[PDB]
Amino acid sequence: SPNYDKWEMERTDITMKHKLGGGQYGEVYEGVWKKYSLTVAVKTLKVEEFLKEAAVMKEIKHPNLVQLLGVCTREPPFYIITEFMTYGNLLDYLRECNRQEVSAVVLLYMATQISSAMEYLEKKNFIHRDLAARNCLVGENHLVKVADFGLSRLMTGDTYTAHAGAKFPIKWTAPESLAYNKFSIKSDVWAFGVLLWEIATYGMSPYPGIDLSQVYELLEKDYRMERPEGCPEKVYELMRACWQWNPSDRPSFAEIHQAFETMFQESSISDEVEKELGKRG
Numbered sequence: 001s002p003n004y005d006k007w008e009m010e011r012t013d014i015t016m017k018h019k020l021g022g023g024q025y026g027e028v029y030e031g032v033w034k035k036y037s038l039t040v041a042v043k044t045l046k047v048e049e050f051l052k053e054a055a056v057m058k059e060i061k062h063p064n065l066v067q068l069l070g071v072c073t074r075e076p077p078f079y080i081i082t083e084f085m086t087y088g089n090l091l092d093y094l095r096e097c098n099r100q101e102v103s104a105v106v107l108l109y110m111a112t113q114i115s116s117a118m119e120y121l122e123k124k125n126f127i128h129r130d131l132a133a134r135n136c137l138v139g140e141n142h143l144v145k146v147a148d149f150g151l152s153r154l155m156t157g158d159t160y161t162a163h164a165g166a167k168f169p170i171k172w173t174a175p176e177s178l179a180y181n182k183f184s185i186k187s188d189v190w191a192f193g194v195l196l197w198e199i200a201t202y203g204m205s206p207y208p209g210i211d212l213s214q215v216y217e218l219l220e221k222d223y224r225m226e227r228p229e230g231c232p233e234k235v236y237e238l239m240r241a242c243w244q245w246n247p248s249d250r251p252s253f254a255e256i257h258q259a260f261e262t263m264f265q266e267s268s269i270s271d272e273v274e275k276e277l278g279k280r281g
């Protein structure tokens, strides 16, 4: 039919149950797709930034990107409707987890899943622009997905320049981005370095006790966050690669993913055996 749009759903298909989290996600609701009795998440507005996130999510698809199910953007109130991620945002997940469940191998699994998604965006020539643990979502069996695509975009040049007044979450933001509003897949890699550090610390805040106003100056003097207690030497080396001052010196997400894939696989082996010991009590 002439007005068919594969993504546009009817608002009345969705029951809005309650606002998720603690207003901490803004206007994101747990809903039900009543036809199917499926729990969904729904972000609502009542614009350009909203519609831009809606547009971007139609273009990207991956096992580790939160899955768009549909939108209601023909008339207000606008909706973006996605799968429901059962455990919420990764930062709080890490802060409250049982570390016998969320063990060294699961920390590697998490980094493998996120870098898998970013390797995909990387070859799609997208940038994400807001990589952080608070912006990843967790499902069953430590399934992790990247979310929050409001600043994501398909790249036309090597660099995107955010508008003059823009402000950024300073502790995740690469030097060139802080100083010159320049973004690229490489400033995503820098933010991924910080995300790695959030994972390794089970969700500590970065640069603890360092004033936001001091951060760029410290970076320019080559200060970088210390290796967290318990963090594998190789993981920390990858963090430091992600935090190379010059963007072209940072690894690709292709390289990053491959390295974490390998480390994950090795760690799984010992984990699986340790599980089977212990079941033989």
Ligand SMILES: Cc1ccc2[nH]ncc2c1/C=C/n1cnc2c(Nc3ccc(P(C)(C)=O)cc3)ncnc21
Residues within 6 Å of the ligand: 020, 021, 025, 028, 029, 041, 042, 043, 066, 080, 081, 082, 083, 084, 085, 086, 087, 088, 089, 137, 147, 148, 149
């Ligand atoms: C609807 C929507 C539209 C565009 C988007 N871009 N990025 C995320 C989204 C979302 C939201 C995704 N999403 C899916 N499940 C979510 C969730 N789930 C959640 C599950 C459990 C809890 P608790 C531990 C308090 O019971 C809290 C939140 N919290 C926030 N966003 C979620």
